[PDB]
Design a protein around this ligand. Sequence first.
Ligand SMILES: O=C(NCCCCCOC[C@]12C[C@H]3C[C@H](C[C@H](C3)C1)C2)[C@H]1N[C@H](CO)[C@H](O)[C@@H]1O
Ligand SMILES: [Zn+2]
Length: 1005
Amino acid sequence: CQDVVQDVPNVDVQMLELYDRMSFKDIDGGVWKQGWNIKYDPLKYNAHHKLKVFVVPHSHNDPGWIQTFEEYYQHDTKHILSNALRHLHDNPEMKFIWAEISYFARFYHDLGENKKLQMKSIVKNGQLEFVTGGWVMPDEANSHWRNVLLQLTEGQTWLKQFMNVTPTASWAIDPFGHSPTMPYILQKSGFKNMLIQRTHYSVKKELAQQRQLEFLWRQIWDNKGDTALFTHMMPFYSYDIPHTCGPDPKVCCQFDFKRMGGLSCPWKVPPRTISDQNVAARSDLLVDQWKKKAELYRTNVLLIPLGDDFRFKQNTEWDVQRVNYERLFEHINSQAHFNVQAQFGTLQEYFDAVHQAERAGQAEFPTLSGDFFTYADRSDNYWSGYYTSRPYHKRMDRVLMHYVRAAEMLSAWHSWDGMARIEERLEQARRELSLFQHHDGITGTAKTHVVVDYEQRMQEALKACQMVMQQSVYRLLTKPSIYSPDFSFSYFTLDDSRWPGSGVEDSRTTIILGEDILPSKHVVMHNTLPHWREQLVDFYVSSPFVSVTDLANNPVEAQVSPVWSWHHDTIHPQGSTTKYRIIFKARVPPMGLATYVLTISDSKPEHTSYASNLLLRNPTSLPLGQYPEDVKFGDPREISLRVGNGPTLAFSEQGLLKSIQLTQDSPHVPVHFKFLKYGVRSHGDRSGAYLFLPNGPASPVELGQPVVLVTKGKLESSVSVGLPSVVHQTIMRGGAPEIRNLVDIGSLDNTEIVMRLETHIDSGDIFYTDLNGLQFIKRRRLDKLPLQANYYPIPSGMFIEDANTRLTLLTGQPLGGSSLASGELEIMQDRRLASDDERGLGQGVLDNKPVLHIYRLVLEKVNNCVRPSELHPAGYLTSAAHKASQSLLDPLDKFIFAENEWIGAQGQFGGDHPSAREDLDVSVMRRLTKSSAKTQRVGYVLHRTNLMQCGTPHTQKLDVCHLLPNVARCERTTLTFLQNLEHLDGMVAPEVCPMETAAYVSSHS
Ligand SMILES: O=C(NCCCCCOC[C@]12C[C@H]3C[C@H](C[C@H](C3)C1)C2)[C@H]1N[C@H](CO)[C@H](O)[C@@H]1O
Ligand SMILES: [Zn+2]
């Protein structure tokens, strides 16, 4: 294994370093507004050194944006692919690339057998070429890497099954900035090349000037270059035809043959039919554009994309584009003075030719590390807004992410009879989640009715996962001698205390116990992580006199708290007189299950404690039915609370963290939570779904005298306050506290609510943010850039640190954030914007709705931690912050047995499963084979992160090939499971290096 801490990789372009140098001047460059006037020497080209031009037709199909997936399919995409099939069949030299497999499967499954064979023919002979072949073209800012892999795996498995093809070239023309997570996953999925478009205009200029638009993109920690993927960055403002032929859109627009009027050319010179009369002059103009574009790149091979949104719909558009380009190609190729060979081509064709030029020693390409956030398309129009837009669904993404892993893991242990419909359920679940990864899904940049479609699909997917999980649990914990399933029956319902949140939707079930009817209830906890976990769990119960046992009747220590809900004239808490929370510690095996029993008594049981409740405000009495401890009252004041050995938190009189004492000796380290607001510009560019354009720094929110509720218990205490737009909550269970914000922005139009942390941490201009929950990247605040350019994606966490102290905030949801000054962290909660931001959504964001945001706050000492070089572009979590992220993203699942009685019930599953080192995860367990198959196969994705070593190192070796019994073979595969990289002598899967991801398939006889 490489070391990813001590050795800094040496690369030609390190993006953080480049950002430090660059001046980012927005100077008028001419016809190319954000570059310069390109010059070429015309003697560069001659009969022995010619320009090879690949013109690559394409059609950018959004799986939802202005219309839903199904609306677009019917109005646009089904016509585009019909005409692709007809026109390419008839025109052998004509070519076309296709990215979005969601649309292509929809189409293909509706064809007659004859058309399917014709379609296979134009794919087999290379006319229609799939690029990337993911279900969607995903967002790269907010997306979790697991969901990036999910949507790629889904599209590629479809392509391999139905077209016998796996793309090795990726096409990503539309995501709003680009993550190095993509090459990381692609290069481990058999990919050899990738293309990107939406990078900062100043980055395009800078790289174009050095011919560094094509580069070997490696991970920021990779010394060796094993992760390197050949990347082509397109040079111009857009992927459309005006911005793809060359530097002068006014010329290029004239070679978009669909623009001959109800579309026109903004530059006011229309396209003209190519004729014998004009082909010489038209060709001179176009080749001059081609040759200017070629100056920006190192080979004599030129990529010319030919397409736009939902292009190639009309069969006449196929004609007018194909016929005019043929006449140009016929003239140009027959005229030696051009020294061009021009033809319709595919992306793979382009890349093969570029590597032939490299193999032949005509170019050597520079190395790059870093990301391409935050994207600006012009002036100060930074796309940091979509890091936060529609935060309800951003949260829902992470919840569905977990349920799909748990459903596929739980159901993977057994083959299922097809009458169970496990395969169907999981396919629906994978595809709805995969679709939401689209750059108009998770981004929150779609119209209101499309967001509603995405919500409804994710809701159906969650229900499908629940059905699979509860069937799997009943099977895993019922004696085989009794197990006799009704595949349509709910044996368990799922309890989830964090989605949607009782504050958002009053939807948790009360386990109703009574000494006559239902004295006891079985509950089950699932642990998807491959190590022993001991986590507090809670359930709603109809009486406070409840005791907890394992199935062996060993007593388990519990706490009962009241059920609090918040209400709005003044924002004040009310208690239930009818239901209570039972809280206890579940110990659950690796990738396993543990059963416990909730039992009623007439009175206080031996092993169950009751929290006190203190309501700080001019009081009036609050009953809690049979809850034995009466609510105490009082005036706002400062409070300290501690749970177990874990930290002591001090809170203000408005109920907001002002300090954390780690240990009993150590200091009360200042840590202030405050809510602020950004507004919208009155004159200038308006903030929208995409753009964050604040009218200067955030201004504090008037809290007034808010009602602060304090609940204090042996196992769990919390401080909650009803602030305007936010019920803020700090929960303590004996480690890093958990923060919950119930965010209701109401109709505070032209407002972005932010949450800031103020410390004395001497961070300076340095902060760290993660990319797709895979890696932490060093950010440097740049005073030379406006505020919105210092905002970055916070997909799963952010941190600051000096020589001694670190503060890490972990998120349960992707949101936008920064460190706008030394010892600060801030993360946006929600945004409501009256105005469109003129990127084609055609509305602002006025569909806000209550969301429950969840966080972990890890203050820790790092003076004794081995930290990377001051010159390393990466950061790494501590064990405590990694485990805290794990408790947000993949908590224990909770199952309440539905029936009065459970014959066959067992207490545990997975007792024998290995408990792997804390840095290793089984990201994916997925059975690859239906029952009717003599060889069963199960895929595993193993990720190993890298944690800062702090000199405090109980760990069985995990071999996923020996998890299921009767193994006949073990293969290391691509992360899609679609290719064998080795049959493993030993039938053992070996341990993977820090920051490595590897996939294995185990076979069974
Ligand atoms: O960018 C994308 N598509 C092309 C965009 C066309 C819409 C541009 O309208 C500009 C204006 C229309 C009217 C209202 C105002 C002022 C003028 C008139 C010009 C704005 C792609 N990226 C999108 C991201 O959401 C989407 O995933 C699409 O595939
Ligand atoms: Zn798009």
